[PDB]
Write a protein that binds this ligand. Sequence first.
Ligand SMILES: *[C@@H]1O[C@H](CO)[C@@H](O)[C@H](O)[C@H]1NC(C)=O
Ligand SMILES: *[C@@H]1O[C@H](CO)[C@@H](O)[C@H](O)[C@H]1NC(C)=O
Ligand SMILES: *[C@@H]1O[C@H](CO)[C@@H](O)[C@H](O)[C@H]1NC(C)=O
Ligand SMILES: *[C@@H]1O[C@H](CO)[C@@H](O)[C@H](O)[C@H]1NC(C)=O
Ligand SMILES: *[C@@H]1O[C@H](CO)[C@@H](O)[C@H](O)[C@H]1NC(C)=O
Ligand SMILES: *[C@@H]1O[C@H](CO)[C@@H](O)[C@H](O)[C@H]1NC(C)=O
Ligand SMILES: *[C@@H]1O[C@H](CO)[C@@H](O)[C@H](O)[C@H]1NC(C)=O
Lengths: 48, 48, 27, 193, 49, 49, 214
Amino acid sequence: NDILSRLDPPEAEVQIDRLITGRLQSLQTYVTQQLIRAAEIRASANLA
Amino acid sequence: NDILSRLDPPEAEVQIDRLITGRLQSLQTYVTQQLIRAAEIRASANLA
Amino acid sequence: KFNGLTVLPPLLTDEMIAQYTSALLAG
Amino acid sequence: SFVIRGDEVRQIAPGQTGKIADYNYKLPDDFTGCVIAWNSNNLDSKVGGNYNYLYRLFRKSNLKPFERDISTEIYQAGSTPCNGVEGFNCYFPLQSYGFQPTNGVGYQPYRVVVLSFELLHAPATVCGPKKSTNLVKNKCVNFNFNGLTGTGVLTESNKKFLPFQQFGRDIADTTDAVRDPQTLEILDITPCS
Amino acid sequence: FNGLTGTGVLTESNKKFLPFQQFGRDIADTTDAVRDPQTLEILDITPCS
Amino acid sequence: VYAWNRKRISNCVADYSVLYNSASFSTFKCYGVSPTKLNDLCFTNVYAD
Amino acid sequence: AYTNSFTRGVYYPDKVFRSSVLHSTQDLFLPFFSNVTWFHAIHDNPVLPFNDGVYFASTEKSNIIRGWIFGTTLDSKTQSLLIVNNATNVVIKVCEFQFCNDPFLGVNCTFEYVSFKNLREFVFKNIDGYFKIYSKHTPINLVRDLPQGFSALEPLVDLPIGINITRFQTLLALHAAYYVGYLQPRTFLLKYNENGTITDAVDCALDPLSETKC
Ligand SMILES: *[C@@H]1O[C@H](CO)[C@@H](O)[C@H](O)[C@H]1NC(C)=O
Ligand SMILES: *[C@@H]1O[C@H](CO)[C@@H](O)[C@H](O)[C@H]1NC(C)=O
Ligand SMILES: *[C@@H]1O[C@H](CO)[C@@H](O)[C@H](O)[C@H]1NC(C)=O
Ligand SMILES: *[C@@H]1O[C@H](CO)[C@@H](O)[C@H](O)[C@H]1NC(C)=O
Ligand SMILES: *[C@@H]1O[C@H](CO)[C@@H](O)[C@H](O)[C@H]1NC(C)=O
Ligand SMILES: *[C@@H]1O[C@H](CO)[C@@H](O)[C@H](O)[C@H]1NC(C)=O
Ligand SMILES: *[C@@H]1O[C@H](CO)[C@@H](O)[C@H](O)[C@H]1NC(C)=O
């Protein structure tokens, strides 16, 4: 909202693109770690 | 060091950002492969 | 919290887990 | 505010290298402001030359952003020290602009005004003219507190803001609570369901 | 060394640089060894502990 | 313009301070290397077209 | 003389309300368990360096220390900040005042504003020409040295003087021991309570235990 409230679209799309790339990297890393942890938990539950 | 020794700080921020993005992608890929291989090794060690 | 990060409840509640463990233990 | 040469107008920018940029007025890279300039050859120019406008072209270090230097000390150009006496390898560090009306556009006086808006979060003193509206509590509203735009529900709360604190922040720096700039009262911001 | 900036420990070595070779490189193109431009001698660059 | 000269320059030391200092140059744009940090770098060859 | 600044010198790094959260910040604070120079006012107002910002505390009984001077040369040739806090008014002036050989109080200006049992803590720092007053008043019952404890310190005045300052001096009321600290760009961990008041802090460069805590 600070970026949107200070910049018109010609610079706002670049800054928003930087935010989207960073947050997409964070989300992909989080989902990958969640998938690995869910697989381990699945192995433990199969053992149980 | 070549980038730092040739370019002043405002322009360097961009090159260094390109290097950081590339090396972060390499590190994340390496850690993901290490996690998958460690999980497979864990399964083998549980079998052992 | 409030950034679209929600927690879905499990299908089986703790009372039903207790009932399953009770049934298995009694059997 | 200052008056420079028309060739020096482009130097008022972040990351700019030049005589005025390095020795007279340096801009930070993260500059949040505006640069305004206009020609004033009809005002700041004598018929024989208005030499009252001065600029620094001798300094042994580049200026740090927003630096003001009024040093009259003579530059030690050579290896020999200058004990306050100018001459050979000892130069007066300032130069006088020669402002004649017959000069070219690039060598004409330009009145430059530089605006800088510190956006550091504190009780704010300078706004724009906007018709204020009555606040509505316990309703999903599109609020705007001193330029901070968001959507949420404004409710009465008990978070004791300190008198110098204007905004409250969450873990992911979302605006958790605001103090109303008109009446000094405390309100939460809960996003709508 | 000729504009090549780095931090490390300079030690005497035995890596026989060819007469046209000025810099040596590692696997990750870090400067492994340099020839001094003043005296034509050979030195390793080992980064500090 | 078509018969632009090319001067090969070697075996010297270059301050570039006169190039910084002269204000007669209306246009001064450096692309691959930033202008300020020129004297700290030693280069293999320089061409002056 | 030197003494131990146990846990003092921590203020609010910004003006953002945080509660029940541990926050890490980068700002010029006083180090924990350090050597602050101890001065006396019995039976001493020298000129001291102003390297990167200075912590200042004072133990008071009858309001002897009442003023401040900041600048470089302090002889009306450069621009100097002068603060005088007499009986009820706090006077801040930035004129090029002419100073005596020892400035004391008996019992080209750009800005002007007019408004042991006590411990008066201050932090004075310069960031891009901004001069910031960080102060808090607390009661004490101690006379020998600076009491051991922790109290958060709060912003009151931000003054954009834009003056290059490297030398500072104090003022005394002559008919109160005081301590001079220094600030370095360290990393700290700030503990906020439920009321938004800083109650504890950890220097991430003090010892490896605090490194682990950070
Ligand atoms: C807004 O108006 C009220 C009176 O309705 C006044 O008390 C208050 O001080 C005003 N706000 C500011 C920032 O002056
Ligand atoms: C550096 O000086 C030495 C003498 O001390 C000389 O032999 C050598 O040739 C010089 N370096 C170059 C590149 O000429
Ligand atoms: C503080 O001073 C004491 C002597 O009074 C000295 O032993 C100690 O090393 C000093 N500590 C620091 C951090 O300078
Ligand atoms: C305090 O000092 C100021 C000096 O600026 C003086 O004008 C004033 O009379 C003094 N006394 C009070 C009560 O303010
Ligand atoms: C005030 O500053 C100006 C610089 O513009 C200087 O000429 C003048 O002497 C100063 N005033 C005094 C009293 O020194
Ligand atoms: C401030 O003044 C001191 C001398 O009193 C000087 O060494 C220093 O460079 C000055 N600071 C700046 C930013 O020019
Ligand atoms: C907050 O302040 C209230 C007084 O208004 C006090 O009763 C309470 O104990 C305080 N809470 C904390 C955690 O300090």
